[PDB]
TrEMBL record, chain A:
<dbReference type="GO" id="GO:0005886">
    <property type="term" value="C:plasma membrane"/>
</dbReference>
<dbReference type="InterPro" id="IPR007110">
    <property type="entry name" value="Ig-like_dom"/>
</dbReference>
<keyword id="KW-0964">Secreted</keyword>
<dbReference type="InterPro" id="IPR050199">
    <property type="entry name" value="IgHV"/>
</dbReference>
<keyword id="KW-1015">Disulfide bond</keyword>
<dbReference type="GO" id="GO:0019814">
    <property type="term" value="C:immunoglobulin complex"/>
</dbReference>
<comment type="subunit">
    <text>Immunoglobulins are composed of two identical heavy chains and two identical light chains; disulfide-linked.</text>
</comment>
<keyword id="KW-0391">Immunity</keyword>
<keyword id="KW-0393">Immunoglobulin domain</keyword>
From TrEMBL, chain B:
<feature type="domain" description="Ig-like">
    <location>
        <begin position="2"/>
        <end position="108"/>
    </location>
</feature>
<protein>
    <recommendedName>
        <fullName>Ig-like domain-containing protein</fullName>
    </recommendedName>
</protein>
Length: 116, 110
């Protein structure tokens, strides 16, 4: 009964940042990596990167390196992804997912809309 | 990084057709390849894990085959509820990588 509960929809101006949350329950939180994926209108699902909640170590897919930061707050079993320098290309549904290794359980998604 | 090339990127078919979708890996990934169905507005749904294993609760009309660098997802007889975009996902190594997707459009025979 692992469950991931994400924060609600956000509306942001171009060049703003957004920080989306993912609260985990039903497993040892520091035990699994957390992944993020998004899907923007018309485009393919794309992998964003991962955070190890034990150490806070991260790595991002090349496309997002330098613009995306993942953090965690262990006291509340929550992982955050902050996306900076928002543009229309970033309007998308953002998903978190966890597993022993892969993406076994998914959050419900968070819509971010980048609007002029 | 491992690049997953998925084909077709889009196709139109009709109910009762066989659909065949491929993913080619840029290097050998053994059997560490999964197939997802995506309906925009829902999280991706796992169909096939480790190349050929049908997920509990998923219709046996879906089947996966292949190993190494060449993988196929077959839908035996297309149904209206298959309207979705399908993806392969390699889990051989991080960063994880999706194929570019196959948008399956359903056209009337009628």
């Amino acid at each position: 009964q692992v469950q991931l509960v994400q924060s609600g929809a956000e509306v942001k101006k171009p060049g703003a940042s957004v920080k989306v949350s993912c609260k985990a329950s039903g497993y040892t939180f520091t035990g699994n990596y957390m992944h993020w994926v998004r899907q923007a209108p018309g485009q393919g699902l794309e992998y964003m990167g991962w955070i190890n909640p034990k150490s806070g170590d991260t790595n991002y897919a090349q496309k997002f390196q330098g613009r995306v930061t993942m953090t965690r707050d262990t006291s509340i079993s929550t992982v955050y992804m902050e996306v900076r320098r928002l543009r229309s290309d970033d309007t998308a549904v953002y998903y978190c997912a966890t597993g022993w290794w892969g993406m076994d359980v998914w959050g419900q998604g968070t819509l971010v809309t980048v609007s002029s | 990084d491992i690049v997953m090339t998925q084909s077709p990127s889009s196709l139109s078919a009709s109910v009762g057709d066989r659909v065949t979708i491929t993913c080619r890996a840029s290097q050998n990934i053994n059997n560490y390849l999964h197939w997802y169905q995506h309906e925009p507005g829902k999280a991706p749904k796992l169909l096939i894990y480790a190349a050929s294993n049908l997920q509990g609760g998923v219709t046996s009309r879906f089947s996966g085959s292949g190993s190494g660098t060449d993988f196929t997802l077959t839908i035996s007889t297309l149904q209206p509820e298959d309207f979705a975009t399908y993806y392969c996902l390699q889990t051989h190594a991080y960063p994880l990588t999706f194929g570019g997707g196959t948008k399956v459009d359903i056209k009337r025979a009628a």
